Nucleic acid binder design. Structure first.
Ligand SMILES: Nc1nc2c(ncn2[C@@H]2O[C@H](COP(=O)(O)OP(=O)(O)CP(=O)(O)O)[C@@H](O)[C@H]2O)c(=O)[nH]1
Ligand SMILES: [Mg+2]
Ligand SMILES: [Mg+2]
Ligand SMILES: [Mg+2]
Ligand SMILES: [Mg+2]
Ligand SMILES: [Mg+2]
Ligand SMILES: [Mg+2]
Ligand SMILES: [Mg+2]
Ligand SMILES: [Mg+2]
Ligand SMILES: [Mg+2]
Ligand SMILES: [Mg+2]
Ligand SMILES: [Mg+2]
Ligand SMILES: [Mg+2]
Ligand SMILES: [Mg+2]
Ligand SMILES: [Mg+2]
Ligand SMILES: [Mg+2]
Lengths: 85, 122, 689, 62
RNA sequence: AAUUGAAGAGUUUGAUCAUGGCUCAGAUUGAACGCUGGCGGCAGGCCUAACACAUGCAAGUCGAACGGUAACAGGAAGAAGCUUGCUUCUUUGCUGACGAGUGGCGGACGGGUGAGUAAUGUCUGGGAAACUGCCUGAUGGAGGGGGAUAACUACUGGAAACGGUAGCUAAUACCGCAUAACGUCGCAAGACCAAAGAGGGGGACCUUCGGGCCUCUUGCCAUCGGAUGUGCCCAGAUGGGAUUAGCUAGUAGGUGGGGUAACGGCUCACCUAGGCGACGAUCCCUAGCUGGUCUGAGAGGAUGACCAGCCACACUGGAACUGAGACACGGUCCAGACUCCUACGGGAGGCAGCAGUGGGGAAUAUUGCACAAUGGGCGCAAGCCUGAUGCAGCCAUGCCGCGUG
RNA sequence: CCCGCAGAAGAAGCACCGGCUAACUCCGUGCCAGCAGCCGCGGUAAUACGGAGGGUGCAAGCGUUAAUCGGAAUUACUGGGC
């Protein structure tokens, strides 16, 4: 509507698209880790875990995931990666 | 092709919903109406709010027929349904104020201009 | 605040017979004034293609030759027709100038006659424009001659036409003696101010030399030099004729073809040239409040105490009530609190709008000699004066044409009944020439207007603007009943030997008819009782008894009228007889007496006065006769012929419409109740409920 | 609903617009309202002088 | 000192007493109508249609984040008609400043409304598992690189709303890399995470003579605190109905995954067969709650306008995105009802913001003024924005004075 | 808000007066026209209808209606009954 704080709309669209691809990727690494967990491949798990940790940790700082989610993920995944692996 | 009996879907607000043809105007022994001819109507359905009501009797323009329409070159446009727009008995002219579904360029008459201005297509 | 032009104000109204072009020409103006918007914008008036309500715009004319210091013209295009004449009474009371249009083919014609009389009624200065010069049968001078003969006026052709019908190319300013040439495209504008052609030199070498001589007759010293063959200067002629135009002793004629664009423009010039300013005009008459006269006067002055008249009331869906006015004197600023003198209530001005050709522009101030619409004013009807509260005055108020046609309307769907009451009410306050009332007897809604068409578009306005459709019929009639023969001693009796109060009554009377005597009564009760055959205390009830049946007689309901009754004989029991017992006997006495008295059905007759041209007093006379009507005189009133007749009401319905047809549209008439007379048998037996 | 028309004389007929006041009449059972003289189409009582506020009669020009 | 204050009368009967209804005197009102009408002060003013809405206004602001010049001014990489230091054209972003654009903060506040909500709310009182912009106390960071893009430019589509291809560019936009604890995960060993610059002035010294360099003011990252705000949990109290008595499958619990800022059937699979109800479940009907307001001696009854707190809603149904905060009154998407513009191909919109119109009604206001004060948004600030607010207009609607001698 | 200036000058209504209920007469009218919160006024001396004079009560307001509580111990916990 005819109020130049409509540029806000066009900005937040750029934002979604940004957040879109990053948060997509982040998730697809958290996907990879569980893949091992399900496969049983004890090595691949730590491989990816240690591969996703930097992503997840950064994304908390970037503020598109904010702190305790990053915490929780690697937290309970640790609690799973060494429950037989 | 519409003929007496025949249910039409209605393609405007007005409230009609399902409407039956009780005559085909335009000639002695005229058999079918289609394309964009006019027909005499009886209201079988009607909305609660409604401009028109059940048992009302009006006219209508056929705007969509399942047998469709030709145009030169040879092409054909068919629509899945049979649809008309309710017209005031005396002045023709849509009684509704919105159209729904496509209409065809054949309707490009003087008196049906209002129809094609509304209507989101062809 | 400041304002700008002032005194260069041209308040003119265009009006004429139907067609003529008195709206085409109005739009043409707007084009020419508006170098660098149809006045028929009503829905109904676009469908039908006719002016129904007077349409006001303002626009600025710089003068076609560039010649002029720019003037501000307030134009008002009005209806032709009749039916809505009110839209000219008002549209002629208020403004200063008037441009009478005429068809090059249709001469004067009946409704030119009416708007003419209305120009005189308010003594409004005027010029003239003969349009449609391009049409088959065009003849400029013929119309000129007709203005003189048919309207008994003093025309002065300020111009001359270059040919006629399909060969109509331009005009001759017979002051500046040049044949103005309007060109091809650009519709108007341009000129090349060409000189007279060889064809017309002899005619052109007239002017009606009694133009310069009609310019002469302005003042004698203005002609003394004319007498000495001194050619008067162009400037002192324009001043001269204008002087006399401004004095309604002369009418300049201009001609043109708005369709071909060859003409409208010269006429605009001619407006400022010869039509008044708001100051070349008599200051207004009026009264003070409780007190007496003094004309309100109120000189056309910005620095006088404010005073304006309310003509025309409307309602726009988005801004609410519009109330048009003409400011004669003083000034109103947005927020002033003026007084409605004729209602003894004050109003507070708020928003103000000037209809400006094609845009409702907003204004904060409105000076004298200007017109406008005030938004939001609460209780301002048409004809009211809006003056200064400290310097209070009633103004003259034009006249209200008074209806000629009446009709009963019922609201088709019983629900709408309420809504009718409202809408008829609204349309009423807008249009004072329309009226509505409820028949005091036979309770049906009745509307009345200035004609068949008038009523038509009123009803039509109900549907369109209030979604009330209602169908229409001929009003019912208030019949009466009486007896013909004086009937001798008829016996009404009671005797109630039942189970309680005795109750016996016996009365013998004569029910004799009367003549339309004593206004209130129409009913005579004689106590011609014997010595004391009935006590004088039971004599008030027998009277009361009879009183009861007179309300709806035995023939077909309807009031019983012109009756006399005499007491002669009766009897009682020393107790059993009673207040009631004789009242009932009277009831029985009224019947039988009534059955045997040869009853008859009365109908109401009108005293009808038709005013008509000498040409067809025969047809009118005859129709009156045809309507079962009785004639009683003819006077021969000056120019028409007052025709007097007694004709039954139930037969005068829709009279106006045919009278019009019989008399080319020139024929007033009037009626009021006179008496009740015997209805012809066929009538009576029909009137059966 | 039915409503009383107090005061001497009145107009009022088939299509009049009026204003209902509330107030019964211990003589007309089922009549539980008064008509308010002088509001809308209902004219005031003619020539009334005492208690004109009721019966909607304006002060007779002192 | 301080909630210290309770009246009866008329009417049933021939008369009486009792019973018992109806009625009246009091106070109060966001009132209306009728008659009448002088002023002022303070206050109140759509109780109905949460009905539809023309028009204007109600959210902007930073050039001290960035490329910048279209306009406005001055200064001009400097000039005429000559009116020789007064001008108005043509050039220059120089400086003031500033249209559009990227960016930033705000748009989640302020203001409206009472539809929904009988307990997903509210009031009182408790509680543990949470996040929190701006403002703040404290500790350290503020290294070095990289890929893009609006604007712009060349073509090009529309009636308009909007744009379409191609090419180029800046940053406190964006993304690696380095750095990495009193931070996150971990028993530990260990793993792993960030960011940004910009201005005012200036001795030397130095200079592609732009600056470097010094200094001062701001801004950026990180963490633990504080403050304010919010989320979540329990208990009691918060209308009428039994001519509503049964209700309940993610139902009630457990386990384990997932999930959120956070606890939790919040979610999912499996397992137990539970959970609620006459101390009123369920189902119907009505309703925003409280502080309080009116009445009353009190206890009670009645009530929830104006002020303030809390909740909910933003044409209707639904949905997420952005973000510290929304599932967003003047944002987005989808559907609906409706209206409006169209050059008929297509487009646009939601006054329960202020003012105002139509409509409903017994009934309720001006399309006013100003940011001067108070206060909010951005800004270093000046300032700009601010229909919050401060005032004025209209109506005896109220309360209080005063007059009309 | 202050001080000047003119001149009583620009500024009084509404309800009520049978009992409850503060305030009485004439006249018109005659179970009519009408009044009325309740009882009840009106069918020839009407303090009750309508006008008038007089009076009582309020006063820039007065009435009427609508509405809540009171009176109502008439839902009675306080504080009633069969
Ligand atoms: N041939 C021709 N026709 C003309 C000319 N001027 C006007 N007309 C026609 O007359 C017809 C009616 O014109 P119009 O302006 O409506 O006249 P009017 O005065 O408004 C009729 P009303 O009385 O209802 O207002 C139009 O068709 C118009 O074109 C003309 O100069 N030539
Ligand atoms: Mg997010
Ligand atoms: Mg109205
Ligand atoms: Mg800028
Ligand atoms: Mg509700
Ligand atoms: Mg790193
Ligand atoms: Mg678990
Ligand atoms: Mg878990
Ligand atoms: Mg009690
Ligand atoms: Mg919504
Ligand atoms: Mg909005
Ligand atoms: Mg007394
Ligand atoms: Mg008497
Ligand atoms: Mg009396
Ligand atoms: Mg009590
Ligand atoms: Mg009891």
């Amino acid at each position: 509507n005819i109020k130049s704080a409509k540029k806000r709309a066009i900005q937040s669209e750029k934002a979604r698209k940004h957040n879109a691809s990053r948060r997509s990727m982040m998730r697809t690494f958290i996907k990879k880790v569980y893949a091992a967990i399900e496969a049983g491949d004890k090595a691949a798990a730590q491989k990816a875990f240690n591969e996703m940790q930097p992503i997840v940790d950064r994304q908390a700082a970037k503020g598109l995931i904010h702190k305790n989610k990053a915490a929780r993920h690697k937290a309970n995944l640790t609690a799973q990666i060494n429950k037989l692996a | 092709m519409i003929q007496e009996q025949t249910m039409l879907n209605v393609a405007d607000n007005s409230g009609a919903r399902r409407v039956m043809c009780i005559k085909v105007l335009g000639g002695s022994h005229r058999r079918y109406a289609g394309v964009g001819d006019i027909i005499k109507i009886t209201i079988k359905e009607a909305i609660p709010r409604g401009k028109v009501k059940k048992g009302d009797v009006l006219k209508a323009v056929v705007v969509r027929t399942k047998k469709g329409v030709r145009r030169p070159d040879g092409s054909v446009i068919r629509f899945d349904g049979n649809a008309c727009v309710l017209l005031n008995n005396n002045s023709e002219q849509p009684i509704g104020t919105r159209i729904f579904g496509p209409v065809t360029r054949e309707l490009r008459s003087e008196k049906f201009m209002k129809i094609i201005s509304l209507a989101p297509e062809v | 605040a400041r304002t700008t032009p002032i005194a260069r104000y041209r308040n003119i109204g265009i009006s004429a017979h139907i067609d003529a072009g008195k709206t085409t020409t109005t739009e043409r103006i707007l084009f020419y004034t508006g170098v660098n918007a149809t006045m028929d914008w009503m829905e109904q008036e676009q469908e039908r293609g006719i002016t129904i309500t007077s349409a006001a715009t303002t626009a600025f004319w710089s003068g076609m030759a560039k010649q002029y210091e720019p003037h501000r013209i307030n134009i008002i295009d009005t209806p032709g027709h009749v039916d809505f004449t009110i839209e000219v009474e008002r549209s002629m009371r208020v403004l200063d100038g008037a441009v009478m249009v005429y068809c090059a083919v249709g001469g004067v014609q009946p409704q030119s006659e009416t708007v003419w009389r209305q120009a005189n009624k308010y003594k409004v200065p005027r010029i003239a424009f003969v349009n449609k010069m391009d049409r088959m049968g065009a003849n400029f001078l013929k119309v000129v001659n007709q203005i003189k003969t048919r309207l008994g006026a003093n025309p002065v052709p300020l111009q001359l036409a270059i040919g006629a019908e399909e060969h109509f190319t331009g005009v001759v300013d017979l002051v500046k003696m040049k044949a103005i040439n309007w060109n091809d495209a650009d519709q108007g504008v341009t000129f090349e101010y060409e000189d007279i052609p060889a064809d017309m030199v002899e005619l052109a070498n007239e002017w009606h030399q009694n133009l310069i001589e009609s310019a002469a007759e302005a003042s004698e010293e203005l002609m003394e030099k004319y007498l000495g063959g001194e050619e008067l200067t162009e400037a002192e002629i324009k001043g001269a004729l204008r002087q006399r135009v401004l004095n309604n002793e002369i009418i300049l004629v201009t001609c043109g073809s708005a369709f071909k664009n060859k003409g409208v423009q010269a006429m605009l010039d001619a407006v400022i040239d010869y039509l008044p300013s708001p100051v070349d005009v008599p200051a207004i008459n009026g009264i003070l409040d409780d007190g007496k006269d003094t004309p309100a006067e109120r000189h056309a002055s910005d620095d006088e105490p404010f005073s304006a008249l309310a003509f025309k009331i409307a309602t726009d869906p988005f801004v609410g009530n519009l109330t048009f006015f003409r400011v004669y004197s003083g000034v109103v600023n947005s927020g002033d609190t003026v007084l409605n003198s004729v209602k003894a209530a004050r109003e507070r001005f708020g928003r103000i709008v000037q209809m400006h050709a094609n845009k409702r522009e907003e204004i904060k101030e409105v000076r004298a000699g200007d017109i406008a619409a005030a938004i939001g004013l609460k209780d301002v009807t048409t004809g009211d004066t809006l003056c200064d509260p400290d310097a209070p005055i009633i103004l003259e108020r034009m006249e209200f044409p008074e209806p000629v046609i009446s009709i009963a309307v019922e609201p088709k769907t019983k629900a709408d009944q309420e809504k009718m009451g409202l809408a008829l009410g609204r349309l009423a306050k807008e249009d004072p020439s329309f009226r509505v009332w409820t028949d005091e007897e036979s309770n049906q809604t009745i509307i009345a207007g200035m004609g068949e068409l008038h009523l038509d578009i009123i009803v039509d306005r109900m549907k369109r603007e209030f979604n009330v459709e209602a169908n229409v019929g001929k009003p019912q009639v208030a019949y009466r009943e009486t007896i013909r023969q004086k009937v001798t001693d008829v016996e009404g009796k009671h005797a109630k030997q039942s189970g309680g109060r005795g109750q016996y009554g016996h009365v013998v009377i004569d029910m004799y008819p009367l003549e339309p005597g004593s206004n209130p009564k129409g009913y005579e009760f004689i106590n011609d009782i014997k010595g004391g055959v009935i006590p004088g205390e039971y004599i008030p009830a027998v009277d009361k008894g009879i009183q009861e049946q007179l309300k709806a007689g035995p023939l077909a309901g309807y009031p019983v009228v012109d009756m006399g009754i005499r007491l002669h004989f009766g009897s009682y029991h020393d107790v059993d007889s009673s207040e009631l017992a004789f009242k009932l006997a009277a009831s029985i006495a009224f019947k039988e007496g009534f059955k045997k008295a040869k009853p008859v059905l009365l109908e109401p007759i009108m005293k009808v006065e038709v005013e008509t041209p000498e040409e067809n007093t025969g047809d009118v006379i005859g129709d009156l006769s045809r309507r079962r009507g009785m004639l009683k005189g003819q006077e021969s009133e000056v120019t028409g012929v007052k025709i007097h007749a007694e004709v039954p009401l139930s037969e005068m319905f829709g009279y106006a419409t045919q009278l019009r047809s019989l008399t080319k549209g020139r024929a007033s008439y009037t009626m009021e109740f006179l008496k009740y007379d015997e209805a012809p048998s066929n009538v009576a037996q029909a009137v059966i409920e | 609903v039915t409503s009383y028309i107090g005061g001497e004389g009145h107009n009022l007929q088939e299509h009049s617009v009026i204003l209902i006041r509330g107030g019964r009449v211990k003589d007309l059972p089922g009549v539980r309202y008064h008509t308010v003289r002088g509001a809308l189409d209902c004219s005031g009582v003619k020539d009334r002088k005492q208690a004109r506020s009721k019966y909607g009669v304006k002060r007779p020009k002192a």
